[PDB]
Amino acid sequence: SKVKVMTVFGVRPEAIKMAPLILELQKHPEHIESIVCVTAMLDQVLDVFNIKPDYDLDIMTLNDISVRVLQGLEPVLQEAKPDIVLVHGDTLTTFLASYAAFMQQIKVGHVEAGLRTWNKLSPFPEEMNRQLTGVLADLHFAPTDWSASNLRKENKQDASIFVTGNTVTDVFQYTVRSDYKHEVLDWAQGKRLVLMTAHRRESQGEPHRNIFRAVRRIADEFEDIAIVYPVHPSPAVREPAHEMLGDHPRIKLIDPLDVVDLHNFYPHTHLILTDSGGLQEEAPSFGIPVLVLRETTERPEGIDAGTLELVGTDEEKVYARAKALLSDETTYARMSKAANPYGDGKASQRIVSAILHSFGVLEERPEPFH
Amino acid sequence: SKVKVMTVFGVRPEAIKMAPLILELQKHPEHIESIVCVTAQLDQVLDVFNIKPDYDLDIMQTLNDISVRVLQGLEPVLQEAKPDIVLVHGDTLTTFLASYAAFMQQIKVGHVEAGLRTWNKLSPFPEEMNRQLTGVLADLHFAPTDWSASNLRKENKQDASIFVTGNTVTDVFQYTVRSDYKHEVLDWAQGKRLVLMTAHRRESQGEPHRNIFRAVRRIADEFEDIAIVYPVHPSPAVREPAHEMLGDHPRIKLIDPLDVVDLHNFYPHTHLILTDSGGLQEEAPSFGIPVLVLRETTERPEGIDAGTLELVGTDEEKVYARAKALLSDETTYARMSKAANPYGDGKASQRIVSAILHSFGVLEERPEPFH
């Protein structure tokens, strides 16, 4: 008999962040039996990573989902009798699965533990979901030292916290290929590829107008850049973007990129302007400095590490900081050299070691991630 | 148009501690509409206090079954009654579920008796995990004591959300104690210092009980002005060694366990207590009665910290010696009797209602905390 590890998730983002961990668990058949339970059509990502769910609950109101996840999971847990349920992040499923496991005295491991706004109403219900999971979790896999210190602020036992980095950083192995080809990359071939995204609804109109004027000026000023802008579908973005950026030789407006396309652009790209939490988390793995089109951010670790800079939404600031990053090779090499404080691409390895250690199979505590 | 407060309780003890708070809520009809929701897996308690449940889920059982049933039951009740705040008590599963049901409808949560911690999810199970889960859903924490509030601050709860109110257990004596009260055993004890002893914990049932019974016997032989009342655990593993070792002594009356209302009515007549009851330890010091605790430790420091309780263990000599001391020298009796019950002053319900009124902006000034 083995450590029976059941991973439970049920949305597209959760699936991608859990896939590399599941693949890591399957590398230890000596010590671990890897069970996968989906709550939920997440089989699209599961076909990429070639993950076969052993259970598929179907939950096609917050109270209704809660009841239905609890009902579905009870028989799954008393049949499989896992030693540890692993949940990810801050979905309703993360909390409900931890709670189903708590009610059968099954150990809980929380992947991406410790993220806090300390505001119940923002985000809702994710802040409450991650605080509830926080009280049910036996093992906290904190991506960062800031995450781990959130957990210490709540009086969690130090020995229960493992800073592992984020598994987001483990997916590039499965996703990035050399074979990879795109018309947009061919169009950008000889130039510094500048990747920009603005999907935040609250920046439509005046803020977008300001960003676009700064970007146009930058396109005009630099003859050795090619700006790729995967534009938000909304007419409230498409129109102003086409109107103000649509007929420039060094700006390609395109349809939003798939995750796999996005990951494959990263090796080719020089600078990012985004308001995406995802690009801010991933891009530094490839040396890409990120200028963040926001007044603030929820996560401090990127700022403090210098992988990201807040640049806001006003024209002068966006232009100036974009200019500075594209000429001043000192600031670029600085942001580019700083290592992704969000992970190594070895988080799944550390989480599996932490599970093995907690069950007495590994006598040594793995080295954290700093 | 008022602050609609729905109070939720599930078990006999939960109902008794919530009863005084409901009766206090009913005293503010200008500001508060009081609603009562029962979620039981009780009709005596609810009659003693004259409380009419407005709602009632007749719950049929794993923790998961209860969990699904309470959630299913409460969604209709909260959708209809549309309360502004849900009040929940202690560390029951139902307290958490009711808090969770409320959270999903963005309904405010008030937690009565918040902040009790062992920081061990395995003792008690599932109560420690239940009160931590409730702790993350509560908007208002009604901490019985400063120690309880300190636990909540250790968990990074915001200071303005914590109110130290005292415990509503000290609010129930007004409703249960009558001057008109009579009892055979009270008459038997008349003219004497009544020593009330209980021994309920299964952990001590054997040679610890024999050690205690021996100490009690030597105290019964020694003291002429003493009457020992022992409402014995009805289990033959206790009732037999008790009736064997103490049942002959004319200064000891072994009787059946007391109703809560009877126990409360003994308190004004009792000089001294020996117990392992967490209940007597919370209650008796409201009547200035010193308690010798028949345990090596207790979960809860506030009693020991105040001089209301002394840990005395189960070893014959120390039970004897500490019992003898409390019966012999005032100055020791006096230190313990005079110290204010750190668990409450009978006004907790009043402080909880003020906290609620203040949180809804009806009372502009933050009310003053218990001691």
Residue numbers in the entry:
A (entry chain A): 2 to 41, 46 to 65, 70 to 379
B (entry chain B): 2 to 42, 47 to 65, 69 to 379
Any passages from the paper?
Non-hydrolyzing UDP-GlcNAc 2-epimerases catalyzing the reversible conversion of UDP-N-acetylglucosamine (UDP-GlcNAc) and UDP-N-acetylmannosamine (UDP-ManNAc) are central to the biosynthesis of various bacterial cell wall polysaccharides. The P. alvei MnaA enzyme (henceforth abbreviated as PaMnaA) belongs to the UDP-GlcNAc 2-epimerase protein family PF02350; structural data from 12 bacterial species are available in the Protein Data Bank (PDB). Chemical evidence suggests that the catalytic mechanism of non-hydrolyzing UDP-GlcNAc 2-epimerases involves a two-step elimination-addition mechanism, with a 2-acetamidoglucal intermediate.
Crystallography on recombinant PaMnaA conducted in this study yielded an unliganded structure in 2.2-Å resolution, confirming the predicted catalytic and allosteric site of the enzyme. The crystal structure was solved at a final resolution of 2.20 Å in space group P1211 with two molecules in the asymmetric unit (AU). As expected, the overall structure of PaMnaA forms a GT-B fold, with both the N-terminal and C-terminal domains adopting distinct Rossmann folds connected by a short linker region (residues 173–200). In the absence of substrate, PaMnaA adopts an unliganded conformation corresponding to the “open” state observed for these other enzymes, where the inner surfaces of the binding cleft are exposed to solvent.
